[PDB]
Symmetry: C12
Subunit: 146 residues, 12 copies
């Protein structure tokens, strides 16, 4: 019946929206320096521990914070925002013993490689050596004055 509609309302509405809000917030926090990398490393570690439902022992908690930090050092600010959003929002698996899992999974996929395809489309980079474009602009302005 309404399985697809309920799945969309419980997936598309309040899963990727908060994810993108978190992404932009983390990007701003990195940019202005208000919140530093170790804070997010610790937050990710606590989130993963809560996901596993195991109380974290303080000393190796510091150990996980450290290994997460050295893992994250090899990524830039925007990749860091992507990682943080995915980690703090990453959920799913299965609940109860009913349907609606397959539709949720397929739209998770749709959104996922939709994100990767915009990544490829935005990584095409800019062209031109930025000196011929000046010549073209000069030529158009010359046609305007003439």
């Amino acid at each position: 019946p309404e399985v697809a509609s309920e799945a969309g309302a419980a997936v598309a509405d309040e899963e990727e929206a908060n994810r993108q809000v978190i992404q932009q917030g983390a990007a701003e926090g990195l940019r202005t320096g208000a919140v530093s990398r170790p804070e997010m490393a610790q937050a990710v570690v606590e989130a993963d521990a809560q996901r596993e439902g195991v109380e974290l022992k303080p000393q190796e908690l510091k150990n996980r914070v450290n290994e997460e930090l050295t893992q994250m050092r090899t990524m830039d600010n925007d990749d860091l925002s992507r990682y943080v959003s995915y980690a703090l929002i990453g959920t799913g698996l299965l609940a109860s013993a009913i349907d609606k899992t397959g539709k949720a999974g397929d739209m998770f996929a749709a959104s996922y490689e939709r994100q990767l395809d915009r990544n490829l489309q935005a990584g095409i980079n800019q062209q031109k050596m930025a000196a011929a474009a000046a010549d073209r602009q000069i030529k158009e302005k010359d046609l305007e004055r003439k």
Copy 2:
């Protein structure tokens, strides 16, 4: 019975009157710089999305604003006001299962070609090289003093 009167009262009265008010306001705001182009682009995108009745995902929403701005960059201020008025007021289609649709549609078309014919009649612009008119004025003034 009163089908034509109802159509006129529900079309000519408060459909293009408000549209015309928004056209004037948008022209004034663009002229004085109170409201910028991106605000109008965002408003148009939100209005279109509400018309389609689909909740807008923020990121490709930014993409819609971007491509809409690229679309608008090739239009002047008055054409922009026309576009915004039409987009923010553009409605119609059919409601219920009754008459009055045909008269509404034909007077939409009438007002539309009315707007285009004023555009053509205003586009005739001005003539003369603005030096013979001075000679004409001098001649009339000479006739007056004479």
Copy 3:
């Protein structure tokens, strides 16, 4: 019966008084610049539209204002006041299905003819070159001293 008395009372008195008061007010306002020409043009256009009982759309309302301004530009202040008074007070036609229209119309024509004939009698213009009159006054004063 008393139909002629009603014609005179409600058709010879209670608007030509207002007509001449409006004439005086418009003349004074134009003379002192308190009210400009576009204000009167707009008022005349609204009065005509209300007489026709049709709601007025904005840009062609401006179009009527402009063509009325072009019409007025070939008229002086006094003629403008006359025209404005006539337009603002001009009424008549027929009401109900009774008498009293014929005398109303004929005495309207009588008042109008009086207005034009007194206009001509005022426009007969002054004479004399204003140098012989000085000689006549000098001669009379000489006879007084003598």
Copy 4:
């Protein structure tokens, strides 16, 4: 019966008395310049119109004021006072279908020719060249000292 006494009390008492009070008041107003000629011209015009019981239409009301002014310009201040008093008090004609008319008429007459004969007796002016009278005064004073 008492028609003559009632006639005298209704004419000789409160007809000429007010007339002469207005005469002296108008003379004083002319002399001191407190009230000007056009005010009295307009007052006379309104009084005549009220006597005729016809409402005066404003424009030709100004016309009557003008013709009254150019009629009055050929009279001096005292003649102006006479004219104004007569115009503002001029009444009479007939009332009811009874007596008292003839006595009123004859005393109106008597007062009239009384005013004219006083005017003639006052218009005899003065005589003598005003140098012989000085000689007579000198002679009398000489007889006084002697």
Copy 5:
């Protein structure tokens, strides 16, 4: 019976006593200039009119005042006081249909010729050249010192 006593009490008591009081007052007023001649002329004219019991019209009243002033211009201050006293108190004639008129008339007469012969005895004038009196006084003083 008491006819003579009543006549005396109604004549000698409060008829000429008031007259003499007004004579004194008028003499003092003229002497000090507090009251001028035209005021008494107007008072005399009003008193005479009230005696005749006829309401006085304004301007002919002015000419009565005028000829009365011309009359008094031939009289000195004391004669003027006599005249004003007589005019303001002059009464008499007859009342009712009873006696006491003859006695009143005869004592009016007696007082009148009493005023006349008092006037003559005052007007007998002084004598002497005012130089022999000095010689007489010198002679008496010489007799005293001797």
Copy 6:
């Protein structure tokens, strides 16, 4: 019976005592100049008129005052006081139809001629040339020192 006692009481006691008191007061008034002669002339005239019981008319009242002043001018201050006292007090004649008039009158006489005889005895004045008295007093003083 007690007729003589009553005559002595009311014809001798408060009828010369007040006379002498008035005499002394008048003499003092003349000596200090507080009250003048015309005031007593007027007072005497009013007293005489009241004695005659006749109301006094103004100018002949002044006439009696003036003739009384002329009468007084030939009298000195002391004689003036005598005359004033007599005039202000002098009474008598007869009352009722009873006795007591005779000894009252002869006692008035006695007092009168006793005033005259003391006047003559006081009018003998003084003797001596006022130089022999000095010699006599010198002789007495010389006898004293011796």
Copy 7:
């Protein structure tokens, strides 16, 4: 019976004591000038008049005062005090139709002749030339020092 005791109580005491008090008071008044001679002359005159029980008329009252003054001028201050005391206290004569008369008279006598005999005894004055007494005093002082 007790007639001698009553005589002593009401006669021998109660005027001679007051007489002597009056004497000393009059002497002091003369000495200090507080009260003058004419005051006592007038007081004596009034006392004598009251003794005679006759009211005094003011003028001859002044006459008695004057004759008393010229009578008193020939007496010194102490004789004046004696005379004044006797005059203001002098009483006696007879009362009722009983005793108390004769012994009153004889003790008045005794007091009187006692006053005269002390006057004679005090009139012996002083003796000696007031130079031999100095010699006697010198001699006694010489016997004292010796």
Copy 8:
């Protein structure tokens, strides 16, 4: 019985004690001049008069005061105090018809003789020429130092 005791208590107790108190007071008053001789002369005269029970007429009261003063001028201050004390306290004679008179009289005599013989023992006078006593004192002092 107690006749002698009563006499002593009524004589020796409050007769001489007060007498000697007045003696001391009079001596002190004369010594300091607080009270003069004439005051005590007057007091003595008044006391004697009261003892005789006769009212004193003022003038011969002064006479007795003067003669008493002449009597006292021949006595010194202490004799004067004796005299005044005796005079102001001098009493005695007889009262009632009982005994106690003889004892009082004999003790009066005893006290009197005591006063005289004390006076003599005080008046035995001092001896020596007041130069041998100096030699005696010098001699005693000589044996004192030796």
Copy 9:
């Protein structure tokens, strides 16, 4: 029985104790001059008179005071205190017809010649010429230093 104890408590307790206190007070008063000799002379005289129970008359009171002063002048201050104490406290004699007599008397004696014998033992005076004692003291001091 207790008669000897009663005598001791009535004599030795409050007779010589107050006597010695009085002696000390008198000695101190004489030493400091607070109380002079005549005061105690008068006090002793009054005490003796009160003991004799006879009222004291002023003069011979002064005589006893003077003779007591003469008696005291031959006594020194200490002996004066002894005498004053003895006189002021000296009492005794006999009362009623019972015991308290012999023991009181002979203990009075015991105290009396006890006072005399201590007087003699104190009057043995001091010995030595006050120069050998200095030599003895010098010798003892020399023995101390040695």
Copy 10:
């Protein structure tokens, strides 16, 4: 049954959590000098005595404090914190007569060997002489500029 969950709760929850917290606190206190070594020596001695349940006498208490200080002097700060944490945390032995002892012991030993093996893995120390690393970094930056 649930002996394993109770084992984890009673071994890993609040047993080495407080141990590691105490480790951190002791390390910080030693680093900042807030708490000195003798304080922890005394605390350790008191904890051991309380574990043995024997009251400590003063001097040998000082003796244990001193020997514990000697024991600590051969240790650095970090291992001192380790020892202190073990001292006031180390507990165990057996309670009641039930299970849960074996799991407690074995996973106590598990955490223990974990602590030593991580100690050895952290004690592997750093390598390189710190001059070749600079060369490598220089080469990498050269490749970046190139």
Copy 11:
């Protein structure tokens, strides 16, 4: 029975203790001069008199004070304290007709003998000439430095 305890409590408890306290107080008073010798002489005399139960007459009271003073002059301050304490506390004799006197007296004697023997043991005085002891002390210090 408890006779020994009663004797000890009422003989040795509050009898020598207050005696020694009195000794200390007297010694301090002598040392600081707060209380002088004559005060204690008088106190001792009064205490002895009260012991004999006889009232002391003031003069020979001074005599006993003097003889006590000359007795005490032959003793030093500490012996004076001994004597004063013994005199002020010295009691004993016998009371009632019961036992407890004998051992009271013999241990009185024991305490007295203790006092005298400790005085002898304290009077053994110090030895050495106070120069050899300096040599011994120097030798000991020399042994110390060496």
Copy 12:
């Protein structure tokens, strides 16, 4: 039963603890000079007297303080603290007629020779001449820099 436990709780708990507290306090007081030696001597003497239950008479009390101080002069401060602690806490003997005495005695012993061998082990004294230790420290430091 609990005899040993009762003995230990009544001896080891509150006998040596208080004793050693007083030892520490006395050592501190002697070190800082707050409490002097005579105060401790007096306290010890009073405690001993109270233990003997005999009231100490003041003078021989001073004797005990004196020779007690002479005994104390041959001991140092720490030996003095030992002595005062033992004297002020020294108790024991036997109470009631029950057990627990032997165990108390043997633990008194145990504590006693525990104090003795602690004293010996503290008095084993230090070794070395304090110049070879400097060489040893220099050698170790040289090995460290090497």
